A paper describes a structure:
It has been shown that the yeast [PSI+] prion state is caused by the formation of amyloid fibrils of the translation termination factor Sup35. Sup35 contains an N-terminal highly aggregation-prone prion domain (N or PrD) and a polar amino acid-rich region (M) (M124-D253). To understand the atomic basis of the prion strain phenomenon, we determined cryo-EM structures of Sup35NM Sc4, Sc37, S17R4, and S17R37 fibrils, revealing markedly different fibril core structures with distinct amino acid packing.
S17R4C and S17R4N were determined to resolutions of 2.2 Å and 2.4 Å, respectively. In addition, a disconnected density belonging to residues N108-A115 forms an interface with Q30-Q38. Furthermore, S17R4N is notable because of the highly “kinked” conformation of residues N8-Y16, which is reminiscent of low-complexity, aromatic-rich, kinked segments (LARKS) associated with reversible amyloids. S4-N9 have a significant elevation change, forming a spiral-like conformation that crosses almost two layers of the fibril. For S17R4N, significant elevation changes occur in the N-terminal residues S4-N9 and again in N26-Y32, leading to many inter-layer interactions. Interestingly, in S17R4N, although the main fibril core is far away from the chaperone-binding site, residues N108-A115, which are adjacent to the chaperone-binding site, form an ordered b-sheet alongside the fibril core. The ordering of residues adjacent to the chaperone-binding site, along with S17R4N’s low abundance, help explain why the S17R4 fibril preparation (containing S17R4N and S17R4C polymorphs at a ~1:3 ratio) acts as a very weak prion despite S17R4N’s lower stability.
Author numbering:
A (entry chain E), B (entry chain C), C (entry chain A), D (entry chain B), E (entry chain D): 4 to 38, 108 to 115
The structure:
């Protein structure tokens, strides 16, 4: 929840990578481009 | 939760890499570009 | 949780690398560009 | 948790490398650029 | 947890390298640039 006051640029460029608890299987691709953009996964 | 007051640039550029607890399998690609951007995984 | 008061630039550029507890398998790529950006993994 | 008061630049540029406890396998690439950026892994 | 009071520049530029306990295998690249940046691993 956003319950704060006075904060400028709060977590402005924060990035959180993979979080897994338990017995989980993840295969996939997540990409965000905010603007020539090459984001490429070629397994 | 955001329950704070007076904080400027709180965790502005924070990055958290992989967090796994248990028996988890992750294969994947996560990329964010905020702006020529080459982000490339060529396994 | 963010329960603090008066902190400027709290963890502004903090980076946390891989954290694994248990029996976990991770193969992947995580990249964030905040701005010519070349971030490249060519295994 | 952030439960502190009066701290300026708390852990402003802190970096935590790999932490593994148990039987874990990690292969991957984590890079953050906050600004010509060349971050390259060419195994 | 951050449960402190009065600390300025607490661990401002602290760096923690690899920590492994048990039977773990890590191959990878972690780089953070906060600003021409060349960070290069060419095994």
């Amino acid at each position: 929840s956003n319950q704060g006051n006075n904060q400028q640029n709060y977590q402005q460029y924060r990035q959180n990578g993979n979080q897994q608890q338990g017995n989980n299987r993840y295969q996939g691709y997540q990409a965000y481009n905010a603007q020539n953009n090459l984001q490429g996964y070629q397994a």
